[PDB]
Design a binder for these strands. Structure first.
Ligand SMILES: [K+]
Ligand SMILES: [K+]
Ligand SMILES: [K+]
Ligand SMILES: [K+]
Ligand SMILES: [K+]
Ligand SMILES: [K+]
Ligand SMILES: [K+]
Ligand SMILES: [K+]
Ligand SMILES: [K+]
Ligand SMILES: [K+]
Ligand SMILES: [Mg+2]
Ligand SMILES: [Mg+2]
Ligand SMILES: [Mg+2]
Ligand SMILES: [Mg+2]
Ligand SMILES: [Mg+2]
Ligand SMILES: [Mg+2]
Ligand SMILES: [Mg+2]
Ligand SMILES: [Mg+2]
Ligand SMILES: [Mg+2]
Ligand SMILES: [Mg+2]
Ligand SMILES: [Mg+2]
Ligand SMILES: [Mg+2]
Ligand SMILES: [Mg+2]
Ligand SMILES: [Mg+2]
Ligand SMILES: [Mg+2]
Ligand SMILES: [Mg+2]
Ligand SMILES: [Mg+2]
Ligand SMILES: [Mg+2]
Ligand SMILES: [Mg+2]
Ligand SMILES: [Mg+2]
Ligand SMILES: [Mg+2]
Ligand SMILES: [Mg+2]
Ligand SMILES: [Mg+2]
Ligand SMILES: [Mg+2]
Ligand SMILES: [Mg+2]
Lengths: 117, 230, 251, 55
RNA sequence: UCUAGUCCGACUUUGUGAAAUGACGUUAUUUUACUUAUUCCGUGAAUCGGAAGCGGGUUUUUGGACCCAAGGCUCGCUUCGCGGGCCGA
RNA sequence: UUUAACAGCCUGCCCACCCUGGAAUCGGCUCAGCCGGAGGUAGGGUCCAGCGGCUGGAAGAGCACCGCACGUGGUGUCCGGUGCGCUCCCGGCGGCCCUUGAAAAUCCGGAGGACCGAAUGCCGUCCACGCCCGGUCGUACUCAUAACCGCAUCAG
RNA sequence: GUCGAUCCUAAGGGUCGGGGGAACCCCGACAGAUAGCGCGUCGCGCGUACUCCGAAAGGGAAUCGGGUUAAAAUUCCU
């Protein structure tokens, strides 16, 4: 018997796709690795003052990189921990990242290792 | 236990909310359900010409079971059975026979057998759609003096021949061991369809109104009848 | 010529009804078993103003016949209705102002409003402020009822049609003069884009049959036939007569 | 600002039936109405039993 | 000199009846009956139709509340606890 | 001649509400209204607003002033009055309409009580405290008698 | 994370199905087996044909002082 005057489509089984062949032969290579994310440090006078005043490293990064990926790229690249990352898109269309290291790390020491100072 | 008590509910207009009720007859069914139900009603509302009305007079249930039981004894071989005999013949051919007695199916093949007068019994499904495929078969069988019957279910006929459906079946000859009971079946079938063919040519079917319409019409004629005696 | 003003209204656009602040359609309950056989009690919760509608509206709450929930309704308020009043709808509802009854149960000479034309259409007749219908007679053989409409016309409706007892509230509205163009502006601001009206004789020929001429005058009979095509049918349409209605004409 | 995480429970509740939804006077009116109306139904029920047996 | 629209008639959609009248078993006209075509109205398609019981000759002083069943009967039961069936309706 | 968000405590406007009590020789009351046996005046309470008060924040800051050196120290930042004043916000009342002057996201509360613990150790907990996390895009500058439009660094 | 966009809906816009249309297109939830949601752990319950677009002045979770640049900040520093 039916207690509802409105007919509802009954639930029916649905299977998950089990393709006989993969549409793509192999996964695509990672196009946003650590080297791709971190293009090069910024060596302007304004950028340099932030190395010691704020313990901050200024990087030019891929425009498609987010703060989450920038944090991991810096960890893999220079083996340093980050307190916070601020990003902006410059008028020339490139992305700049202000990376502040934790007190446990010294930006000036890391800057010398990079080779900008 | 005195703590248990009866808590009756007073139903009616403005009373306690009625419990769940069966509202099946008021369900707003999908389009497909609605059309097939209206299709059934429309057929019986309109007058059915005799050539189409003869298919409502199907074979009786009691005689149908006997006829279908005999058909099961002449089923065509299955796909597995068909392959099994062909390998028995291949070995026989390498190592240096009787005509089968089975039911004939297929409208094209059955019609040929009827025209050639090699058919001894024709079984016709009543639910062939489009009906024009078999609406003429009873006339052909009558003209050829071959007994025929109309049974319910093309699916049932198909199951005999290992097919989803079958419009009609034919028996060109039965095995000699059971030619007596088969002869009796022909007499009953021939007396119900072939003999009544002429009288059924003027029996128009349909014209049946709905239950509410019939009750309303019957009430009106009672007033006329009640006024006839006075 | 160009498309005249009367023709441009049918396209919609700037002539659609102004309905942004309207409270919704005012109508009876959907006809159901309770009203067909017995009666259902409702309670008036508030009497509200509907922009563009002179007659006040009443919000009524009903107990749903078979669902555990409240059933909200919006009725055209009858004169005398008040908040907290019980309103009874159904075949067996008593004859009191505010109740909704089928015409079959309403005696001759009663005053009713919001009368259904078709059984279950929820009311099409006598809905404006101060208007009502009068039950004339019943025809048990045909199952129909005769009622007098506000315009004075007599109409046949099936006896199953429902009607609210009493007249529509807010009567006498049109007696008060507006006195000002601005009052007319506010009136039609919430109805539709039909005010102000420019006279055809003040237009040019391109846009109205009455336009043009070195004097403002129609120049041809303002009475036009019924079958005149759109754009030509202006003025007194299919006028059976004209002039001041004196004598039996103004009855 | 009424969100539970931002406001203590005591500030968004009243310790009474229909607390925070109906005033005290409204609750009092409903309680009396519920009791009196229910009592009247009992009187109606008993009244018709006496007339029912009349036969 | 034409034209959208509009009005009007025929055929078509378009079937089932009856009566009156008329013409040559057919057949026109008129009125009327039927419901399934077609059209329209209503709803979140929620008690329609018929026949029984019951009553006689289910809710109206009140701005409340109202759902997911109490109860009875009856099977299974891995028993005084779960799962079904029929009433309640 | 200064004092932020935020946190706690206090205060309790104009209204609303509660208890006691029972009012004409009527009373109370606003600039205006208006309110009272459907319970006034009066007496005692509750609640609501705050861009109100105190403390924390917070003087360690800021500002002013005077020094010492050419970063560093000191002193002060205090006590009142006034209003048909101006800008903004709020409260409450009244006038006006044949005009009555959006919706939804979201959030809070309520009615109902299926179901659920313990013989006292489990269950429940919108309480306090502690721990972790925080995407993407915009952000410069003009906003006009020279950064907008008018062919221009145009009296528009 | 704290200013906005983003989210919500307004007048309205774009659409499924259906109905039109030689077709470009027209109508726009109106001719229809909606979307799914809730609670247990895959089962029950509910279920009225749009999970769409539409506001940097409507609605709306949360940041305040002090300091800092040649040019940035309720975003940087404390
Ligand atoms: K034109
Ligand atoms: K206008
Ligand atoms: K005018
Ligand atoms: K003229
Ligand atoms: K704040
Ligand atoms: K900025
Ligand atoms: K300028
Ligand atoms: K916005
Ligand atoms: K608003
Ligand atoms: K700060
Ligand atoms: Mg940013
Ligand atoms: Mg005028
Ligand atoms: Mg002119
Ligand atoms: Mg002209
Ligand atoms: Mg009829
Ligand atoms: Mg319909
Ligand atoms: Mg007092
Ligand atoms: Mg302090
Ligand atoms: Mg100081
Ligand atoms: Mg201002
Ligand atoms: Mg509770
Ligand atoms: Mg700026
Ligand atoms: Mg400037
Ligand atoms: Mg400016
Ligand atoms: Mg230009
Ligand atoms: Mg914000
Ligand atoms: Mg809209
Ligand atoms: Mg389009
Ligand atoms: Mg389509
Ligand atoms: Mg719909
Ligand atoms: Mg549906
Ligand atoms: Mg959305
Ligand atoms: Mg949007
Ligand atoms: Mg805004
Ligand atoms: Mg700046």
């Amino acid at each position: 018997i039916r207690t509802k005057v409105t007919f509802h489509r009954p639930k029916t089984l649905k299977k998950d796709r089990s393709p006989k062949y993969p549409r793509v032969s192999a996964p695509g290579r990672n196009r946003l690795d650590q080297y791709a994310i971190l293009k090069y440090p910024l060596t302007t006078e304004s950028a340099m003052k932030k190395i010691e005043d704020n313990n901050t490293l200024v990087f030019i990064v891929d425009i498609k990189a987010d703060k989450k990926k920038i944090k991991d790229a810096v960890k893999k690249m220079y083996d340093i921990q980050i307190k916070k990352v601020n990003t902006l898109i410059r008028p020339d269309g490139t992305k700049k990242a202000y990376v502040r290291l934790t007190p446990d790390y010294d930006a000036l020491d890391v800057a010398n290792k990079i080779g900008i100072i | 236990n005195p703590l248990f008590e009866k808590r009756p509910k007073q139903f009616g207009i403005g009373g306690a909310l009625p419990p769940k009720k069966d509202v099946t007859r008021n369900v707003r069914w999908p389009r497909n359900v609605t059309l097939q139900r209206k299709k059934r009603i429309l057929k019986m509302r309109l007058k059915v010409p005799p050539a189409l009305n003869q298919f409502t007079k199907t074979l009786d249930k009691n005689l149908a079971t006997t006829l279908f039981k005999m058909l099961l004894k002449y089923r065509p071989e299955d796909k597995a059975a068909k392959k099994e005999r062909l390998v028995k013949r291949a070995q026989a051919e390498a190592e240096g026979t009787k005509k089968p007695i089975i039911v004939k199916y297929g409208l094209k093949h059955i019609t040929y057998l009827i025209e050639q007068n090699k058919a001894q019994l024709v079984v016709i499904a009543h639910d062939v759609d489009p009906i024009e495929l078999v609406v003429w078969l009873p006339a052909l069988c009558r003209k050829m003096e071959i007994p025929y019957c109309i049974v319910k279910g093309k699916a049932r006929l198909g199951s005999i021949v290992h097919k989803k459906t079958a419009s009609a079946l034919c028996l060109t000859t039965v095995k000699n061991e059971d030619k007596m009971e088969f002869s009796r079946v022909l007499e009953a079938i021939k007396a119900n369809f072939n003999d009544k063919y002429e009288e059924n040519r003027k029996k128009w079917g349909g014209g049946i109104m709905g239950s509410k319409s019939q009750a309303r019409t019957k009430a009106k004629e009672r007033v006329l009848a009640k006024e006839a005696a006075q | 010529g160009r498309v005249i003003r009367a023709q441009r209204k049918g396209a919609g656009s700037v002539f659609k009804s102004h309905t942004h602040h309207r409270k919704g359609p005012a109508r009876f309950r959907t006809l159901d078993f309770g009203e067909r056989n017995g009666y259902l009690k409702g309670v008036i919760t508030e009497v509200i103003h509907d922009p563009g509608r002179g007659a006040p509206l009443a919000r009524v709450t009903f107990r749903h016949p078979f669902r555990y929930k409240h059933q909200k309704e919006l009725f055209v308020a009858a004169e005398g209705m008040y908040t907290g009043q019980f309103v009874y709808c159904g075949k067996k509802a008593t004859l009191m102002v505010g109740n909704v009854l089928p015409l079959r149960s309403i005696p001759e000479g009663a005053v009713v409003c919001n009368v259904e034309h078709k059984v279950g259409d929820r009311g099409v007749f006598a809905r404006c402020s101060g208007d009502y219908a009068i039950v004339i007679s019943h025809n048990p053989d045909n199952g129909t009822t005769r009622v007098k409409l506000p315009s004075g016309a007599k109409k046949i409706v099936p006896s199953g049609c429902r009607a609210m007892i009493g007249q529509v509230a807010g009567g006498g509205r049109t007696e008060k003069p507006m006195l000002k163009a601005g009052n007319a502006y506010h009136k039609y601001r919430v109805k539709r884009n039909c005010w102000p009206k420019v006279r055809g004789v003040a237009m040019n020929p391109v846009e109205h049959p009455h336009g043009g001429g070195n004097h403002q005058h129609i120049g041809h009979a303002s009475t036009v036939r019924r079958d005149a095509p759109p754009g030509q049918k202006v003025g007194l349409i299919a006028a059976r007569r004209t002039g001041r209605l004196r004598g039996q004409a103004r009855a | 600002e009424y969100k539970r995480s931002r406001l203590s429970r005591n500030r968004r509740t009243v310790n009474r039936a229909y607390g925070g939804v109906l005033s005290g006077s409204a609750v009092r009116e409903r309680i009396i109405r519920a009791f009196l109306v229910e009592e009247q139904k009992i009187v109606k029920k008993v009244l018709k039993i006496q007339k029912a047996k009349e036969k």
